[PDB]
């Protein structure tokens, strides 16, 4: 199976440098070129550059001066680096592979790395329960994931086992400049005495991992 | 660079219907166009290559046509899972460039929200902030009003909303409204109410609690 | 329309 797995999301200060690692498997970097594409609110999808099988590189014109792509064939790693970051460089960065060695029809994508370009400092969130209260046999419950920077946090339930009826809402920016996010799930009210419910929260930029058990309040 | 123009920006259809996305190029690009799907929280997925060529693992209901400057991606019978954005890419001319995309939305029957309200936790109150949360669950269409009242005082400017994208299976939306106040203010009041207005309700539905039960 | 990180979807 062909896969591309990228390093985690990060905060970078203005004028500072960016570094992402793409690690591939199911093919060899000696046979395929790896492309870089970013996606931003302002500019949408932009192709940035490519490192070919033999090690040559092409950079999209506005990036020639502040972009370098490198790799280690034996380690199956591609190294993306961009200098002189400004605010509009905040985007999701992807690595990608084409169908054939020389082409640009991107059939395989990395999961994407969100890079936030900002002067602020990293902050890990607090996790608070949204406790079920005493809906025709259905109870709702959740977690409030509050006051973190930058994006993203991942949230899951019962270590990935519970997915049905889960809604994890988009994060919103509070006036404080810190993000906040809620995640809910509906379950049978009669399973509240039997099953445990835990939201698993991860804020990689601050290395904060929290498991919050959510229970009906006393 | 080649400018790719995608129209319209939003498409709204009912399941089973046929649907077409347009990609127009600023000059001839032969058949050098690829189409991508981006679902909620996903990476782009390659649907069609070189205008009309199929991709392994892609449902047969996806097809493309066109050449020169006018291109079309078609879904013959739309499914709810097709809810996503669709992008075109040209590669006749370096550098490869992408269109701005077209959003595909699905219609469905009206569905009233289920409404739940959650008091702040004792845990959060320790920090000196109180978050009151109102959940509107699995409803359609997206339009909804959430009005907050504290001891009959209409709240304004102190809440924030967030809405899920359409559910891939039942096409509904869900919404959270969070009312945020100081611990001080929270402790100075009793009745916390969330009033929900929506097309699927004959009357607004209010959920409320008294601080401290 | 604009790409939104939160959902990785276009917001109009």
Numbering used by the authors:
A (entry chain B): 1 to 134, 138 to 221
B (entry chain A): 1 to 213
C (entry chain E): 1 to 12
Task: Give me lines lifted from the publication on this model.
Finally, we substituted Leu5 with diphenylalanine in an effort to increase hydrophobic interaction between the meditope and Fab. The structure of the diphenylalanine substitution shows that one phenyl ring is in a similar position to the leucine side chain, while the other phenyl group contacts Ile92, Leu114 and Pro155. There is a slight shift in the backbone residues to accommodate the bulky diphenyl­alanine. However, it was not as severe as the other substitutions, and the off-rate increased approximately fivefold compared with the original meditope. In addition, it was observed that substitution of Leu5 by tyrosine and glutamate strongly reduced the affinity, whereas the substitution of Leu5 by diphenyl­alanine moderately reduced the half-life (by approximately fivefold).
